[PDB]
Design a protein around this ligand. Structure first.
Ligand SMILES: O=c1[nH]c2cc(C(F)(F)F)c(N3CCOCC3)cc2n(CP(=O)(O)O)c1=O
Ligand SMILES: O=c1[nH]c2cc(C(F)(F)F)c(N3CCOCC3)cc2n(CP(=O)(O)O)c1=O
Ligand SMILES: CNC(=O)N1N=C(c2ccc(N)cc2)c2cc3c(cc2C[C@H]1C)OCO3
Lengths: 370, 81, 122, 49
């Protein structure tokens, strides 16, 4: 028994044609075929009832889903991405985890083009632009004193006129000075070299960022994600992802949980597609917390505008659920480890996530920087 | 050990500690709390987005030194009657 | 900002000499003319700096293209397609190849839309 | 013993380390950073990671 969810178990293009086990394809289908090869048994692939996961009811307290089908003997095994939890280990046995996961953040891919008045000053610095004027006035104050010409000899004095001459150095290459002056010759001599180095470094650095456009602006940390309110972040309306932030002991996840609880507008969404759409429409101003297995697959699908940022937050894993006291429990428990040590599990992961992913690497090199 | 009484209770207790958060709490306690480098190590907001101040401060220093030398020259110039 | 006490030819001929050279100094030497030319020199400086920088960007991104004489790099790009024949030894050679390069090329040709294979060589 | 991990020898084919102490009954449990592997799951049971 397994659930039909992308991309673990998907129906082929010609699902109506043919019958039996060829009607399904995906990760768990290859895993089931490999388990039958390393254990030796005839297996029939069945879909779980109405697409229910392993969850125990609260009122009637009835097990529904794949775990339910194993408890009441309706199924013999459940090779499916079922999270290993304490509530499920009590009723049915679990094999060793074949894939680790954890809650991660999904954001829209940031754009590199940033035209505007705020970016012309960026090639230097917030401080150098405020220091070039301090150097200019430091040169003007020296021009106030170095403007001494030869008079037969307590001076004519310099007022108003000196600032007029001084302002000229910012426009022209520098110096300005007075004719036949010994000290202004070197005032403008050092000023011209200084402004020359400044303009040379400006042009050189400007060329450096028209060839290398990287512009990685996400913080890439959950703690700083909680320390800012511009880019919102939310989870699901109901599920283990939200409950994990609810019953968390770390102050970071508690700050995130209080932020999501006192969120206006509400950051929680009903379905995962609503969170993906909000991330894709907010133009980088919304973040969605969800398990890494789905985050990577959404990142590997069109229009490739989603990105999984950061790392996982908790340590959980999917394992093959077996009925308590069944003959297949231990052989599958060993076969999972055998497939993990051989590398077939990671090979299937790379096969169904990146090889068949719509978002390819894209042409090496190329010219897209006009 | 195979067939031991402690197998299943520990198998369940590990999941109980992971779902409660005590395992991650102990990880953060003995890895990051007692770590000598408590905050991020050698990590800036971004790796050299533009130009550093020390990079141009030298040119500014040679400018100030030139202005000082020119002030000295002006001082010896006005004294010549 | 010049002599305008009420066609004037004096202020119509002075205008172009500041656009070319660096500064704003003609026969009159007025501070208001300095601040006219003061922002102009910085503006045209930024303009020429950005022009030269972008010109270097296109003299750097023009000679960084890869012609590729190696098949392995030919497989690492998808703008220039590559295919073989519908039937023949070349296709079977890409089929039963043990080297990962020819296997990547074979997967690229197998999952090709439109089909890269052709009927005849011509 | 002498800081040995759960490893089975090749010549004498003797289990040494924590897995060895659990196999020969010298110890009752091994709460230690021991990696779950197929070679060790056959001789001694493993809890969830
Ligand atoms: O055992 C569980 N395993 C689960 C496995 C997956 C998937 F990733 F698809 F495998 C998902 N999804 C994540 C993306 O959105 C679509 C469904 C939910 C699971 N939930 C519900 P939770 O309470 O919200 O964690 C479980 O309970
Ligand atoms: O033994 C073989 N010798 C071959 C010799 C030649 C030629 F080069 F013309 F001499 C060609 N062509 C190459 C260009 O397309 C037109 C014909 C095909 C040959 N094939 C068929 P393959 O199975 O596609 O290799 C053989 O089997
Ligand atoms: C079309 N413009 C463009 O694509 N950008 N703007 C330039 C830029 C170019 C010219 C001028 N005069 C100013 C900015 C730039 C400046 C930077 C920088 C990166 C860029 C590249 C992008 C943002 O990183 C640091 O500084």
């Amino acid at each position: 028994t397994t659930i039909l969810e992308s991309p673990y178990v998907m129906m082929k293009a010609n699902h109506a044609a043919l019958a039996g086990n060829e009607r399904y394809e995906g990760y768990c289908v290859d895993l089931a075929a490999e388990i039958a090869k390393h254990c030796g048994f005839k297996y029939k692939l069945t879909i779980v009832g109405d697409g229910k996961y392993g969850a125990r009811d609260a009122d009637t307290k009835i097990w529904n889903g794949m775990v339910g089908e194993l408890v009441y003997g309706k199924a013999d095994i459940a090779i499916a991405p079922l999270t290993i939890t304490l509530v499920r280990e009590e009723v049915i046995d679990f094999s060793k985890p074949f894939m680790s996961l954890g809650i991660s953040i999904m954001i829209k891919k940031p754009q590199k083009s940033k035209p505007g008045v705020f970016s012309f000053l960026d090639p230097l610095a917030y401080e150098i632009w405020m220091c070039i004027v301090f150097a200019y006035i430091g040169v003007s104050v020296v021009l106030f004193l170095v403007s001494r010409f030869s008079p037969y000899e307590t001076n004519e004095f310099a007022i108003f006129q000196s600032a007029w001459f001084s302002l000229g150095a910012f426009m022209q290459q520098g110096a300005d000075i007075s004719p036949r002056s010994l000290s202004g010759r070197i005032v403008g001599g050092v000023w011209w070299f200084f402004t020359l180095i400044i303009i040379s470094s400006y042009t050189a650095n400007l060329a450096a960022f028209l060839t290398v456009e990287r512009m990685v602006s996400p913080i890439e940390s959950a703690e700083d994600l909680s320390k800012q309110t511009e880019i919102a972040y939310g989870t699901l309306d109901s599920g283990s992802t939200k409950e994990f932030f609810r019953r968390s002991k770390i102050a970071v996840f508690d700050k995130m949980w209080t932020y999501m609880r006192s969120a206006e507008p509400s950051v929680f969404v009903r379905t995962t597609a609503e969170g993906v759409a909000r991330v894709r429409k907010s133009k980088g101003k919304y973040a969605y917390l969800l398990e890494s297995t789905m985050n990577e697959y959404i990142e590997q699908r069109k229009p490739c505008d989603t990105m999984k940022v950061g790392g996982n937050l908790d340590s959980k894993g999917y394992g093959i659920a077996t009925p308590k006291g069944s003959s297949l429990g231990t052989p599958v428990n060993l076969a999972v480890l055998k497939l993990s040590e051989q590398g077939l599990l990671d090979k299937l992961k790379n096969k169904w996530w990146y090889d068949k992913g719509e978002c390819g690497a894209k042409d090496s090199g190329s010219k897209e920087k006009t | 050990p195979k067939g031991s009484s402690l197998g299943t209770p520990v198998n369940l207790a590990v999941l109980k500690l992971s779902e409660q958060g005590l395992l991650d709490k102990l990880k953060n306690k003995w890895w990051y709390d007692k770590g000598e480098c408590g905050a991020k190590d050698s990590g800036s907001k971004e790796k050299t987005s533009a130009l550093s101040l020390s990079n141009v401060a030298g040119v500014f220093y040679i400018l100030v030194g030139g202005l000082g030398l020119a002030m000295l020259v002006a001082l010896i110039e006005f004294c010549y009657k």
